[PDB]
Structure formats: C-alpha cells, structure tokens
Amino acid sequence: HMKSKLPKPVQDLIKMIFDVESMKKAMVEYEIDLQKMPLGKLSKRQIQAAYSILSEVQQAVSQGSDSQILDLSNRFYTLIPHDFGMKKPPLLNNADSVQAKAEMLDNLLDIEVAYSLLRGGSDDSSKDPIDVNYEKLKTDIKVVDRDSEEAEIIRKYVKNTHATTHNAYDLEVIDIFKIEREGECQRYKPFKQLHNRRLLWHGSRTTNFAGILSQGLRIAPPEAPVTGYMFGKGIYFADMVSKSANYCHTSQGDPIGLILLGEVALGNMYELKHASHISKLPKGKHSVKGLGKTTPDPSANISLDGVDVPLGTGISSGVNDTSLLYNEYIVYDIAQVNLKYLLKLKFNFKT
Numbered sequence: 569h570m571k572s573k574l575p576k577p578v579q580d581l582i583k584m585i586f587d588v589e590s591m592k593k594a595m596v597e598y599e600i601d602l603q604k605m606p607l608g609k610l611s612k613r614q615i616q617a618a619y620s621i622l623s624e625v626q627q628a629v630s631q632g633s634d635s636q637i638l639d640l641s642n643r644f645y646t647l648i649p650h651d652f653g654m655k656k657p658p659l660l661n662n663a664d665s666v667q668a669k670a671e672m673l674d675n676l677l678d679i680e681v682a683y684s685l686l687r688g689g690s691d692d693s694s695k696d697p698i699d700v701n702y703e704k705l706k707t708d709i710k711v712v713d714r715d716s717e718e719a720e721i722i723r724k725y726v727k728n729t730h731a732t733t734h735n736a737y738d739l740e741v742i743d744i745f746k747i748e749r750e751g752e753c754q755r756y757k758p759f760k761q762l763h764n765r766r767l768l769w770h771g772s773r774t775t776n777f778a779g780i781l782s783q784g785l786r787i788a789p790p791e792a793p794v795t796g797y798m799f800g801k802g803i804y805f806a807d808m809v810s811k812s813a814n815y816c817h818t819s820q821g822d823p824i825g826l827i828l829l830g831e832v833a834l835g836n837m838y839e840l841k842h843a844s845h846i847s848k849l850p851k852g853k854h855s856v857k858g859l860g861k862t863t864p865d866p867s868a869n870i871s872l873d874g875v876d877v878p879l880g881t882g883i884s885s886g887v888n889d890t891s892l893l894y895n896e897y898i899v900y901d902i903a904q905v906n907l908k909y910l911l912k913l914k915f916n917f918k919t
C-alpha cells in the first residue's frame with residue numbers, strides 16, 4: 569500500500585480507536601459472554617430492547633420484592649448474554665444494578681458503531697488501512713503544535729485541574745489534536761453566541777471514540793432508563809481533568825487514554841445538588857450544573873478563541889450539602905456541543 573502520509577500521532581490514534589481486541593476487552597470487563605454475544609453479532613435493536621427491559625427493572629425497583637424482580641432480571645440476561653456458565657446470575661434489584669447496566673449498554677451502542685464502520689464500506693489493498701479508517705470518521709484531525717498558544721493553555725488546563733482525591737495517578741499529555749467533525753459547526757450555529765460557553769472535559773474509554781468522532785457525542789436513546797444516570801439522559805462534562813480522566817477507565821494493564829475538550833453552550837444553568845433523573849429541563853434553562861464542593865478559581869478564567877477555559881486551581885465553592893465533590897455540566901440537546909480538541913494521555917499510576 570501507499571504507506572499513509574498522515575502524521576504518526578494521527579496514525580496511532582486511528583490504530584487505537586479501531587482496535588478490535590480493545591472492543592472485545594471492553595465487553596468482557598462488563599461481564600458479557602463473547603461466545604454467545606460476539607462483537608459481530610451486536611446490533612442497535614437488541615441493545616435498545618435490553619435498554620427497555622432495564623427501564624422495566626427501574627420501574628419495579630422504584631415501587632418495591634425479589635419475586636417479581638427475578639423475571640425482569642432474567643429477561644435482561646436473555647437479551648444480553650453474560651459470562652456466568654451454568655449460572656443462576658446475580659439479581660438486578662437496586663438502583664446500582666440499573667446504573668451499572670445502563671453504563672454497559674451506553675458502551676455497547678458506541679462499540680457497535682465502531683464495528684459497523686470497520687466492517688462496512690470499501691476494501692482496497694492499494695490504500696493504507698489507516699487512511700481508509702480515517703476517512704470513515706468524517707472528522708479533520710490535525711496535530712496541535714507544542715510551541716503554540718492553544719497548546720500551552722490546554723497543558724495548563726490539565727496541569728491545574730487534577731484533583732487531590734485522584735492522586736493515585738498523574739497525566740502526561742502525549743499528543744494534542746485539533747478536531748473538526750463534518751457539519752458540527754453548522755449544527756452549533758444557533759448556540760455559537762449564547763452566554764456561558766465553556767471549554768470542558770469529556771472522558772470515555774478509547775473503544776467509544778470511533779462512535780464519538782463519527783456521530784458526535786449523543787444522548788442515550790428513548791429506551792434507556794433515565795434513572796440509570798444521575799442527572800438523566802444528557803451529555804456530561806467536567807471542569808476538572810482528573811474527573812473526566814477517571815472515565816477513560818485506564819489501568820496498569822492499559823495506561824493510555826483519550827479525552828475530549830468541547831465547547832459547551834451552558835446558558836442559564838439549572839443548578840442542582842443531588843440526583844434528578846430528568847429527560848427535559850424546566851422552561852428557560854439550557855443546562856444542568858451539578859454543584860461541586862470544589863470548583864476552579866473563577867478569577868483565573870482565560871479565553872481561548874472566544875470560549876472561557878476554567879483552568880484555575882481548585883478552591884472551595886462555598887456549597888454545603890451536595891452529592892458532588894467537583895462540578896458537573898449536562899446538556900440535553902446534542903446541538904449545544906462543538907468538539908474542539910482530543911488529547912492522548914499517558915496515566916502514570918503511582919499505586
């Protein structure tokens with residue numbers, strides 16, 4: 569083949585996110601049986617069907633015994649086979665179970681998209697498969713220069729917003745990519761001048777990034793249980809890098825992760841202290857802010873291409889009886905997110 573004239577970092581990005589073995593590895597981490605539910609046998613309607621049964625489990629848990637729950641729990645395991653052998657699998661009878669499986673299904677939707685792109689489209693031996701897979705993302709990915717202004721700001725945002733309670737690792741920025749999804753700037757146009765636009769973090773496991781770069785950050789579908797997510801079905805961001813970096817789910821066995829920086833149009837924020845499982849905001853509100861006990865210093869905010877970057881060091885917010893140690897930002901319209909950068913991070917685990 570031609571050998572590919574993209575930068576080496578962009579080639580390694582494409583290798584990482586289209587890695588089939590990482591997709592398999594992600595599935596067994598959620599206790600899925602690859603023999604009964606292999607990667608190729610995944611589909612949207614079966615994930616959607618499992619979402620609906622989980623919504624039924626949600627309903628039973630909220631209204632109260634193990635007798636009726638058993639049938640709903642077994643229906644779920646029928647749709648998504650789990651690795652338990654000749655089993656009697658664990659009962660899905662609480663909010664934690666709903667949250668845990670809601671997380672699994674989110675990942676399986678994004679894993680399905682990555683695999684469908686891979687096994688879809690054309691096959692040409694003369695082209696480098698790195699270039700072929702790059703084109704499937706519909707996203708212009710450029711390496712950001714390390715001497716540039718935007719690179720310094722991004723490194724400082726990483727450097728200043730690593731929380732003390734997440735100190736079991738630290739982060740090395742390996743690569744900084746400037747990203748532009750096709751048609752997203754067009755989709756963002758109604759929100760481009762809205763007040764309270766902030767550059768915020770979104771972390772996810774590497775196996776979801778083919779989906780995120782192809783489709784954008786999406787909201788969980790109608791079938792998904794709203795009670796599976798703390799502030800319901802939206803797109804969640806943080807202003808602390810380590811809070812988002814935790815959701816990469818890296819480890820000593822897999823220490824390289826990927827994290828996004830997105831321009832999020834927050835507008836009038838519906839500020840909340842505890843769980844509120846909602847599908848729509850109250851009239852007038854553009855987003856939810858989960859109020860953190862700790863927040864970046866407001867006086868240290870810096871502008872990057874018109875957008876605020878809350879890169880101040882963590883200080884006390886003066887918010888008392890809150891569920892959250894750090895800030896949390898949720899939008900419920902996909903059009904309010906314009907993805908700006910993608911960082912490849914090395915996690916150095918001190919423990």
Ligand SMILES: O=C(N[C@@H]1CCN(CC2CC2)C1)c1cc(Cn2c(=O)[nH]c(=O)c3ccccc32)ccc1F
Nearest residue numbers: 674677770771786787788797803804805806812815
């Ligand atoms: O935005 C979230 N999930 C996206 C939206 C639906 N996406 C799956 C699409 C349907 C295929 C996953 C989301 C994330 C999390 C966890 N999470 C997270 O995964 N990454 C973060 O950066 C993050 C930052 C602050 C707070 C939570 C974060 C929890 C609940 C959620 F609904």
